[PDB]
Design an enzyme around this catalytic site. Structure first.
Site, PDB file in Angstrom:
ATOM      1  N   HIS A  83     -52.705 -22.611 -31.344  1.00  0.00           N
ATOM      2  CA  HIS A  83     -53.006 -24.033 -31.536  1.00  0.00           C
ATOM      3  C   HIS A  83     -53.905 -24.149 -32.760  1.00  0.00           C
ATOM      4  CE1 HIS A  83     -56.438 -23.009 -28.785  1.00  0.00           C
ATOM      5  NE2 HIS A  83     -57.085 -24.020 -29.333  1.00  0.00           N
ATOM      6  N   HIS A  85     -57.076 -24.994 -33.444  1.00  0.00           N
ATOM      7  CA  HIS A  85     -58.523 -24.815 -33.497  1.00  0.00           C
ATOM      8  C   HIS A  85     -58.902 -23.546 -34.269  1.00  0.00           C
ATOM      9  CE1 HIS A  85     -59.174 -27.440 -29.652  1.00  0.00           C
ATOM     10  NE2 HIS A  85     -59.151 -28.169 -30.755  1.00  0.00           N
ATOM     11  N   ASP A  87     -60.680 -20.899 -33.578  1.00  0.00           N
ATOM     12  CA  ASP A  87     -60.541 -19.568 -32.999  1.00  0.00           C
ATOM     13  C   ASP A  87     -59.102 -19.073 -33.021  1.00  0.00           C
ATOM     14  OD1 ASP A  87     -60.069 -21.632 -31.106  1.00  0.00           O
ATOM     15  OD2 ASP A  87     -60.565 -20.330 -29.415  1.00  0.00           O
ATOM     16  N   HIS A 148     -55.062 -27.635 -22.895  1.00  0.00           N
ATOM     17  CA  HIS A 148     -56.281 -27.522 -23.688  1.00  0.00           C
ATOM     18  C   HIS A 148     -56.164 -28.299 -25.001  1.00  0.00           C
ATOM     19  CE1 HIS A 148     -59.498 -25.526 -25.996  1.00  0.00           C
ATOM     20  NE2 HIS A 148     -58.571 -25.378 -26.928  1.00  0.00           N
ATOM     21  N   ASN A 179     -66.120 -27.744 -23.034  1.00  0.00           N
ATOM     22  CA  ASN A 179     -65.680 -28.780 -23.958  1.00  0.00           C
ATOM     23  C   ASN A 179     -64.162 -28.895 -23.899  1.00  0.00           C
ATOM     24  OD1 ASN A 179     -64.762 -30.188 -26.326  1.00  0.00           O
ATOM     25  ND2 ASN A 179     -66.804 -29.904 -27.213  1.00  0.00           N
TER      26      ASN A 179
HETATM   27  C1  LIG Z   1     -62.237 -28.176 -27.982  1.00  0.00           C
HETATM   28  C2  LIG Z   1     -62.514 -27.268 -26.786  1.00  0.00           C
HETATM   29  O1  LIG Z   1     -61.892 -27.400 -25.786  1.00  0.00           O
HETATM   30  O2  LIG Z   1     -63.509 -26.290 -26.904  1.00  0.00           O
HETATM   31  C3  LIG Z   1     -63.768 -25.495 -25.780  1.00  0.00           C
HETATM   32  C4  LIG Z   1     -62.826 -24.300 -25.769  1.00  0.00           C
HETATM   33  N1  LIG Z   1     -61.923 -23.999 -24.835  1.00  0.00           N
HETATM   34  N2  LIG Z   1     -61.301 -22.894 -25.195  1.00  0.00           N
HETATM   35  N3  LIG Z   1     -61.770 -22.446 -26.342  1.00  0.00           N
HETATM   36  C5  LIG Z   1     -62.729 -23.271 -26.764  1.00  0.00           C
HETATM   37  C6  LIG Z   1     -63.559 -23.156 -28.037  1.00  0.00           C
HETATM   38  N4  LIG Z   1     -64.967 -23.289 -27.708  1.00  0.00           N
HETATM   39  S1  LIG Z   1     -65.748 -22.084 -26.781  1.00  0.00           S
HETATM   40  O3  LIG Z   1     -66.932 -21.579 -27.478  1.00  0.00           O
HETATM   41  O4  LIG Z   1     -64.920 -20.882 -26.682  1.00  0.00           O
HETATM   42  C7  LIG Z   1     -66.198 -22.671 -25.125  1.00  0.00           C
HETATM   43  C8  LIG Z   1     -66.015 -21.841 -24.030  1.00  0.00           C
HETATM   44  C9  LIG Z   1     -66.361 -22.283 -22.764  1.00  0.00           C
HETATM   45  C10 LIG Z   1     -66.887 -23.554 -22.602  1.00  0.00           C
HETATM   46  C11 LIG Z   1     -67.070 -24.381 -23.695  1.00  0.00           C
HETATM   47  C12 LIG Z   1     -66.730 -23.938 -24.958  1.00  0.00           C
HETATM   48  O   LIG Z   2     -60.593 -23.171 -28.841  1.00  0.00           O
HETATM   49 ZN   LIG Z   3     -58.971 -24.620 -28.744  1.00  0.00          ZN
HETATM   50 ZN   LIG Z   4     -60.348 -21.244 -27.492  1.00  0.00          ZN
END
Ligand SMILES: CC(=O)OCc1n[nH]nc1CNS(=O)(=O)c1ccccc1
Ligand SMILES: [O-]
Ligand SMILES: [Zn+2]
Ligand SMILES: [Zn+2]
Ligand SMILES: [Cl-]
Ligand SMILES: [Cl-]
Ligand SMILES: [Zn+2]
Length: 231
Positions: A83, A85, A87, A148, A179
């Site tokens: 996706h 984002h 990461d 997500h 988040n």
């Molecule tokens: C946009 C969004 O959903 O961000 C949250 C997320 N979910 N998966 N990856 C992410 C990237 N942020 S994270 O640092 O890994 C995080 C991990 C646990 C809880 C909150 C944040």
């Molecule tokens: O993410």
């Molecule tokens: Zn993401």
């Molecule tokens: Zn992620």
């Protein structure tokens, strides 16, 4: 056994071999003053490697390539970002400069551009409708629907029964949504059920962040997502 967020200094990458020709890659990153682990996948395709997702940033992704060269010694020729984002696409420019052909769905490329994230070069066709699947060398790519993010893909390695859920699947240790700014909470459980129905044979399930497990991670994620929905 599996590398944990506490074992990996930010900037280093660990590899973990899951089966013949299948590894995860584990990196760490700081965000809002906390440190998070993050997973991607590496799948052998003959004498080449397919990479799933960057290591969350340019420096980590250079280290990823170096760690792949040291521990596997085969060239990464294609990469897929699951996706838009950072990461998942942060480090695509590093991959491209190293000669890797970078791929993502048109939806992912579109959203990365709007966000100001790096943009994979090639487009993955045939994945725009929920339930769509396409072969991509040694893996199958699957679009389960919005979760997500609206664009999130999952990846299945049939030879090893490895299901890489990406950030649509939470590890068991995560009991709160965190988040979910770009998530579709209303659809996420339905999208997870599509994954269950399409890959019921999966034996090794890899979340986007944290420890792998079995298909129980799917129900766990639904539990967390529904609890957050009802906040
Ligand atoms: C946009 C969004 O959903 O961000 C949250 C997320 N979910 N998966 N990856 C992410 C990237 N942020 S994270 O640092 O890994 C995080 C991990 C646990 C809880 C909150 C944040
Ligand atoms: O993410
Ligand atoms: Zn993401
Ligand atoms: Zn992620
Ligand atoms: Cl090419
Ligand atoms: Cl190319
Ligand atoms: Zn190309």
């Amino acid at each position: 056994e599996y590398p944990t967020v506490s074992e990996i200094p930010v900037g280093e990458v660990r590899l973990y071999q899951i089966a013949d020709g299948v590894w995860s890659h584990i990196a760490t990153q700081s965000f809002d003053g906390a440190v998070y682990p993050s997973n991607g996948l590496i799948v052998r395709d003959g004498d080449e490697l397919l990479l799933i997702d960057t290591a969350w940033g340019a420096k980590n992704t250079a280290a990823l390539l170096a760690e792949i060269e040291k521990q596997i010694g085969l060239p990464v020729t294609r990469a897929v970002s699951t996706h838009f984002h950072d990461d998942r696409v942060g480090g695509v420019d590093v991959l491209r400069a190293a000669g890797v052909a970078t791929y993502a769905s048109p939806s992912t490329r579109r959203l990365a551009e709007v966000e100001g994230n790096e943009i994979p070069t090639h487009s993955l066709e045939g994945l725009s409708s929920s339930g769509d699947a396409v072969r991509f060398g040694p893996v199958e790519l699957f679009y389960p629907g919005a979760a997500h993010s609206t664009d999130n893909l999952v990846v299945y390695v049939p030879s090893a029964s490895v299901l890489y859920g990406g950030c649509a699947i939470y590890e068991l240790s995560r009991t709160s949504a965190g988040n979910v700014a770009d998530a579709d909470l209303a659809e996420w459980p339905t999208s997870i059920e599509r994954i269950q129905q399409h890959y019921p044979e999966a034996q090794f399930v890899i979340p986007g962040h944290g420890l792998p497990g079995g298909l129980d991670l799917l129900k766990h994620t639904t539990n967390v997502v529904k609890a957050h929905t009802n906040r």
